[PDB]
Write a protein that binds this ligand. Structure first.
Ligand code: ZN
Lengths: 50, 595
């Protein structure tokens, strides 16, 4: 499995044309603060292709 | 922010990881089944455990979303399919007891020999050395002895295990908002949410009882005809008016009457033309067989197979260094990977099996566009129904005459048609009542209508009245007849074989009336028909995303089970059975007993 290449899965809004973001902030889907941990309603926005 | 978006995000996150985690398990299982060694078996455990732990964690975390505010049907269906906790609702000790009871029953069924009143140094187990007597031997005092020994040796210790298994299954079903284990099994047919296509759990039972109602006279005529044909070999043992004996049939349990074909034949002089002895004179191979299968499949309007399909699939037996379990399988590895694992021989049996597996291959790739939760069937019967119609259509004599297998001299004759109709009937007509009776017995056992002290009072009498089978020797309240089956020994659903046959006939008729065919239903094919074959492709794109009622109504026009293609299939056969059975007594009475 080639786990090197990655992609974005969860973002708050869409991307503008010719825009690039490399932020690694936790995407919050729920209504509670994440506190920087990956628990409930909070997942990493970057995934791999394998 | 509200429930819908959170549930959608959770489903997307689960599908991102499950598609990758299940692929490893599928690939490892394929490698093991193709290359069974001492290292693949231990490699099974870690992959299976990781996948199971992830699935259970996701199922537990798929509960904070209430199933009342979800208005879209797709997300509701996905959440419901992700809500089924299975056996996790049981306690740890109770689950351990259930697991060890199931393991003990399975390992008891795996073992088991028989004792002979003659020289007892011979041991007969579930090896094919024992069923030969029940299938090929034509004398007495052997098949009956084998049946009695099988029901006496391993038929005694399966009762205490079954007594605890029933109550544990009932408790597990009740722990999952069900009335009984039979209700849990019938819940697969339960579909909620539709506009005129809603289906209820109990209605399935109602959809079963009248189905058997329309096969009373054909099955009674078949029973009378097979009894009359058996009279010649056993004039002093088979009662002309009584029920057929439990043993002396074409199966251990009488499920399949296939082995009764040589004894029950309309005309033994007919050659029963077959082209198995035709591929040697001109040159054929298994690769050519698969090529013909795929060429026929793409001749109806189906996509061409992938290049990697022919590279990752085993079509001939390995020479050396590898061992194969010798079982035809169609694996869906995942991520657009499909494989067939089977040994292909030069025989129309292997041709039919290859076409049946090819139907599964076409079906599996037909729902590749679903979020890993809808990539199944609406009901459990759709999977095996797809491969039956393709096998039937390619087996038609017209189909074999389009590929050069038959010279352009012999077109058709009535006697071979009747022989073929009878030989096909003695694989389905002889098993439908048995399946119905077993399912009903199990349903009343799990409901509680049959008390534990009267089990060996309801299993037999129904067989005397529903199946038309009478026991040769009395059985008291110490044996456990129905647990002796492999299907019964473990948690296998048996109603699937009752409905699937209907799906075998309902589709084919709808696939023949759209092909400008006006002849017999058993002589039609879907070859060289782009339109007749487009309906199945259109319907093979929903899976369990929509109720099975809607998919059926849009493929055959019948919202429920309207099963009358069988009478149109075996129409000359029924007419001939009615004609032949005139100076006889059609039916049976539940009073006679041979001994
Ligand atoms: Zn199949």
């Amino acid at each position: 499995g080639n786990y090197n290449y990655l992609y974005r899965l969860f973002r708050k809004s869409n991307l503008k044309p010719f825009e690039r973001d490399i932020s690694t902030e936790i995407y919050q889907a729920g209504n509670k603060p994440c506190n920087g941990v990956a628990g409930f309603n909070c997942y990493f926005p970057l995934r791999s292709y394998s | 922010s509200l429930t819908e978006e959170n549930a959608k995000t959770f489903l997307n996150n689960f599908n991102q990881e499950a598609e990758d985690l299940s692929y490893q398990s599928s690939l490892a299982s394929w490698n093991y089944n193709t290359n069974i060694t001492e290292e693949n078996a231990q490699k099974m455990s870690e992959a299976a455990a990781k996948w199971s732990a992830f699935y259970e964690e996701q199922s537990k975390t798929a509960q904070s979303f209430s199933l009342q505010e979800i208005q879209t049907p797709i997300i509701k269906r996905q959440l419901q399919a992700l809500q089924q906790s299975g056996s996790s609702a049981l306690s740890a000790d109770k689950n351990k007891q259930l697991n060890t009871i199931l393991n003990t029953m399975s390992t008891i069924y795996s073992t088991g020999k028989v004792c002979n009143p003659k020289n007892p140094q011979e041991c007969l187990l579930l090896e094919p050395g024992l069923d030969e007597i029940m299938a090929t031997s034509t004398d007495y005092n052997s098949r009956l002895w084998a049946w009695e020994g099988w029901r006496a040796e391993v038929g005694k210790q399966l009762r205490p295990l079954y007594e605890e298994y029933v109550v544990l299954k009932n408790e597990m079903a009740r722990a999952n908002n069900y009335n009984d284990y039979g209700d849990y099994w019938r819940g697969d047919y339960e579909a909620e949410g539709a506009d005129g296509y809603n289906y209820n759990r109990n209605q399935l039972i109602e959809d079963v009882e009248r189905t058997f109602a329309e096969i009373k006279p054909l099955y009674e005529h078949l029973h009378a005809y097979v009894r009359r044909k058996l009279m010649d070999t056993y004039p002093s043992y088979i009662s002309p008016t009584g029920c057929l004996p439990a043993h002396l049939l074409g199966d251990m349990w009488g499920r399949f009457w296939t082995n009764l074909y040589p004894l029950t034949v309309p005309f033994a002089q007919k050659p029963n033309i077959d082209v198995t002895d035709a591929m040697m004179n001109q040159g054929w191979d298994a690769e050519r067989i698969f090529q013909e299968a795929e060429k026929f499949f793409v001749s109806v309007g189906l996509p061409h197979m992938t290049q990697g399909f022919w590279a990752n699939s085993m079509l001939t037996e390995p020479a050396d260094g590898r061992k194969v379990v010798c079982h035809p399988t169609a694996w869906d590895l995942g991520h657009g990977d499909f494989r067939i694992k089977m040994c292909t021989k030069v025989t129309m049996d292997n041709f039919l099996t290859a076409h049946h597996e090819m139907g599964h291959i076409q079906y599996d790739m037909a729902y590749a566009r679903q979020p890993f939760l809808l990539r199944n069937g609406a009901n459990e019967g759709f999977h095996e129904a797809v491969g039956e119609i393709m096998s039937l259509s390619a087996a038609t004599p017209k189909h074999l005459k389009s590929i050069g297998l038959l010279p352009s001299d012999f077109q058709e004759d009535s006697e071979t048609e009747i022989n073929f109709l009878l030989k096909q009937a003695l694989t389905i007509v002889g098993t439908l009542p048995f399946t119905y009776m077993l399912e009903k017995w199990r349903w009343m056992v799990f409901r509680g209508e049959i008390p534990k002290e009267q089990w060996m009072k309801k299993w037999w009498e129904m067989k005397r009245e529903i199946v038309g089978v009478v026991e040769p020797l009395p059985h008291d309240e110490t044996y456990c007849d129905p647990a002796s089956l492999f299907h019964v020994s473990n948690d296998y659903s048996f109603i699937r074989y009752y409905t699937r046959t209907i799906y075998q006939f309902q589709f084919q008729e709808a696939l023949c009336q759209a092909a400008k065919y006006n002849g017999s239903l058993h002589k039609c094919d879907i070859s060289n028909s782009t339109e007749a074959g487009q309906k199945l492709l259109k319907m093979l794109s929903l899976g369990n995303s929509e109720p099975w009622t809607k998919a059926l109504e849009n493929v055959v026009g019948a919202r429920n089970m309207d099963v009358k293609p069988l009478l149109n299939y075996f129409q000359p056969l029924f007419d001939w059975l009615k004609e032949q059975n005139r100076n006889s007594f059609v039916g049976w009475n539940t009073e006679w007993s041979p001994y």
